[PDB]
Design a protein around this ligand. Structure first.
Ligand SMILES: Nc1nc2c(ncn2[C@@H]2O[C@H](COP(=O)(O)OP(=O)(O)O)[C@@H](O)[C@H]2O)c(=O)[nH]1
Length: 169
């Protein structure tokens, strides 16, 4: 089907739920078109409609299943989120990315490293240029977002759709 399934991973506190909720928006209850930690919404990209399923399950079992079961949730793209104001979370993200590489199934799947909370300039602990450096060295795409100020949130999800489309030929 024409669904774009995006899996959100990263340390607790980095803003995965906020970013999902901010991209999802508040939905019109009359829309007939999905339970635990799941966001679904259509979005027009480059002229063609895309149905994005966002899976935010890492805190409820996703992380433990990675550790104990050695299994990652199936997606068309993975979003590895850290907070620009938290260096430990950034190192987790890099660790997660390296570990994901070893799921050889994910070879031709878009992985995006996301530095969230770019609105917190004064608390910044990770530079833009080292987020980028990590992306280049560990073979990701890279973006900085703010879910609070809603910066690069649409651009993130349009970019995921274009990458996923580039794959399917
Ligand atoms: N200032 C700021 N705070 C954020 C942003 N995104 C999330 N947060 C806050 O970070 C805290 C944890 O965010 P949450 O969405 O629960 O992170 P999660 O554990 O990764 O799902 C909350 O207090 C959020 O309000 C952001 O872009 N800017």
């Amino acid at each position: 089907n024409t669904y774009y399934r995006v899996v959100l991973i990263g340390e607790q506190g980095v803003g995965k739920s906020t970013l999902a909720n901010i991209f999802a928006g508040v939905h019109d209850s009359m829309d007939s078109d999905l339970g635990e930690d799941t966001y679904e919404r259509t979005l027009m990209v480059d002229g063609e409609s895309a149905t994005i399923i966002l899976l935010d399950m890492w805190e409820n079992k996703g992380e433990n299943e990675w550790l104990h079961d050695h299994c990652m949730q199936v997606g068309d793209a993975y979003l590895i989120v850290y907070s620009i104001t938290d260096r430990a979370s950034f190192e987790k993200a890099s660790e997660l990315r390296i570990q994901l590489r070893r799921a050889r199934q994910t070879e031709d799947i878009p992985i995006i490293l996301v530095g969230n909370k770019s609105d917190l300039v004064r608390c910044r602990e990770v530079s833009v240029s080292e987020g980028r450096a990590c992306a280049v060295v560990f073979d990701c795409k890279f973006i900085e977002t703010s879910a609070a100020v809603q910066h690069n949130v649409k651009e993130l999800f349009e970019g995921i759709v274009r990458q996923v489309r580039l794959r399917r030929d």
